[PDB]
């Protein structure tokens, strides 16, 4: 589960929608199954057929592991304040002198 920034709020539950599965034990459609009209047959004279749809849930941390964002989002100008104590500047200054 990808994230985008540091304080990105997250849901504890991830609902999922799945197609119903045959198998002749539960050959009849269950009670908690809804019907969706999204079985395509044709497209130019568009034709759709019913399809039984089941619903389940998932929980973050036990099935899906939360990932982290890559790169840098917030952009700031460099604006490096000059320092007169590090070694590199102390040698560059003597070289200029």
């Amino acid at each position: 589960l990808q994230k985008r920034w540091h304080n990105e709020p997250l849901p504890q539950i991830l609902p999922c929608v799945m197609d119903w599965i045959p198998g002749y034990d539960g050959e009849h459609a269950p009670d908690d199954a809804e019907i969706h009209y999204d079985l395509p047959v044709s497209f130019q004279p568009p034709r759709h057929l019913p399809r039984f749809v089941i619903r389940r849930e998932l929980v973050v941390g036990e099935d899906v592991q939360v990932s982290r964002e890559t790169g840098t989002s917030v952009w700031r100008p460099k604006g490096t304040r000059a320092d007169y104590n590090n070694s590199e500047y102390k040698k560059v200054r003597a070289e200029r002198l």
């Binding site: 040698k91 003597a94 070289e95 002198l97």
Partner: protein, 267 residues
């Protein structure tokens, strides 16, 4: 040849910045500034306002002689610098960003000195009382160590006998070499006997950085010490072809740091 005059304020308010007076603390600084008073042609055209970085190779290396003395003008103390050279100096190009160095504007006068035999000139001269000893290296170590062995030949200050006087000793030191430069001294009076101090930077190659291109250069300061003796008197002349070359050059070593200038007034 030409003689130039610079006037510097010595008194004034002592709680103000006085960069003209502070300039006379280091004699290497004085020599460097007088060298910067000799532009080398295209330097004036490339930099008329003297703002590009200073480079010794961009200036002429002709020798010159100068003397720094002190005087009183009515009710004020002043320091006078007399510069004797062989080419015409350009004091306009030198102090154009440092007009506050000089209390008065500089002056320049053409000098045409020649004196036939029979001139009793009145002279003033500051020499470097220097001598190269045959055994100047006793290696007088300090601390617990007091005597280790090494030998070298080095230049040191002139010394006199404990039963003699510094005045007579310096008189005979000048008179011993005197016929070589072509004059006879009648009176030699010692007026001062002291030291002249200075410091000089030198580049040092500390370690190369990432593509340093000829090491990393850092300045290291080394001291400069001279023993100076100022004296006046009266001197005659002989062989003016030798005295003119004596006037053109200096007397004694360290000629580039204020020594060797012979000032003569005809009488």
């Amino acid at each position: 040849i030409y003689l130039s005059r610079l006037l510097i304020d010595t008194g004034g308010n002592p709680d103000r910045p006085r960069p003209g007076r502070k300039w006379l603390d280091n004699i290497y600084n004085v020599h460097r500034r007088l060298s910067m008073a000799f532009p080398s042609g295209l330097r004036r055209e490339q930099d008329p306002h003297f703002l590009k970085p200073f480079s010794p190779n961009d200036f002429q290396k002709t020798p010159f002689l100068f003397r720094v003395d002190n005087n009183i003008d009515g009710n004020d103390k002043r320091a006078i610098i007399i510069v004797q050279s062989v080419l015409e100096p350009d004091w306009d190009y030198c102090f154009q960003n440092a007009l506050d160095f000089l209390a008065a504007p500089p002056e320049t006068k053409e000098y045409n000195p020649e004196f036939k035999a029979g001139q009793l000139l009145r002279f003033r001269l500051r020499v470097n009382a220097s001598v190269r000893r045959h055994i100047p290296e006793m290696v007088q170590q300090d601390g617990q160590t007091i005597e280790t062995g090494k030998i070298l030949h080095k230049r040191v200050s002139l010394t006199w006998d404990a039963s003699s006087t510094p005045d007579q000793a310096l008189a005979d030191w000048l008179a011993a070499k005197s016929p070589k430069l072509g004059f006879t001294l009648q009176r030699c009076e010692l007026l001062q006997l002291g030291w002249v101090y200075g410091s000089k930077p030198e580049p040092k190659n500390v370690k190369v950085k990432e593509q340093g291109q000829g090491y990393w250069r850092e300045h290291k300061y080394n001291p400069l010490r001279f023993r100076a003796a100022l004296l006046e008197g009266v001197l005659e002349v002989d062989d003016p072809k030798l005295f003119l070359k004596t006037l053109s050059s200096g007397i004694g070593k360290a000629k580039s740091f204020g020594f060797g200038l012979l000032s003569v007034l005809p009488i």
